[PDB]
Amino acid sequence: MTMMSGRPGRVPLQFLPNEARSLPPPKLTDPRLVYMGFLGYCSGLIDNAIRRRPVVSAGLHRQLLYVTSFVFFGYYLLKRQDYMYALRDHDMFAYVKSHPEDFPEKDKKTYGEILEEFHPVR
């Protein structure tokens, strides 16, 4: 099953609709971005190790490019993910609003009027 492929108004290969510009962008200190940079740093260290170079000191420009590329991709990935979750919430709330018969708010009962069975432990 595909939930969102046929959602009306969806541009085939956009990756970032204009509506997404109404959402707050992720901060540059977002922990997910920090973890993506950490993944880039680990990639650089593994690159040094495989090539039989000093792991921590061999190429600083290469490691910098690794970290920068991972952060650069992660920013847009996070933007798209947040947009998709916002879309899901928007559609859910609109559907609940447009079908009140399927989502009734029934009368509230307090615990002084609800009979719950008691199971003793012995």
Ligand X SMILES: CCCCCCCCCCCCCCCCCC(=O)OC[C@H](COP(=O)([O-])OCC(O)COP(=O)([O-])OC[C@@H](COC(=O)CCCCCCCCCCCCCCCCC)OC(=O)CCCCCCCCCCCCCCCCC)OC(=O)CCCCCCCCCCCCCCCCC
Ligand Y SMILES: CCCCCCCCCCCCCCCCC[C@@H](O)O[C@H](CO[C@H](O)CCCCCCCCCCCCCCC)COP(=O)(O)OCC[N+](C)(C)C
Binding site for another protein (CB under 8 A): 108-112, 114-118, 120-122
Structural contact between residues 79 and 26, judged by C-beta atoms closer than 8 angstroms: yes
13 binds ligand Y (CB under 6 A): yes
35 contacts ligand Y (rule: CB under 6 A): no
**Partner from ligand X, another protein, ligand Y, none contacting 13, C-beta within 5 to 8 A by type:** ligand Y
Whose CA is closest to 94, among 86, 82, 84, 106?
A: 86
Q: Shortest approach of another protein to residue 92 CB, angstroms? A: 19
Closest approach of Cβ 29 to ligand Y, in Å? 19
Residue 54: contacted member of another protein, ligand Y, ligand X, none (CB under 5 to 8 Å, by partner type): ligand X
Element spanning 50, H or E? helix 31-50
Cα–Cα distance measured from residue 78 to residue 51, given in angstroms and rounded to the nearest whole number: 32
Cα-to-chain-centroid distance, residue 113: 42
- Binding to ligand Y (CB under 6 A): which residues in 65-94? 77
* Cα 76 from Cα 21, distance rounded (Å): 12
Q: Can you give the binding site for ligand X, defined by CB under 6 A? A: 42, 45-46, 49, 54-56
Query: Smallest distance from the beta carbon of 119 to another protein, in angstroms?
Result: 8
Which amino acid type is present at position 65?
L
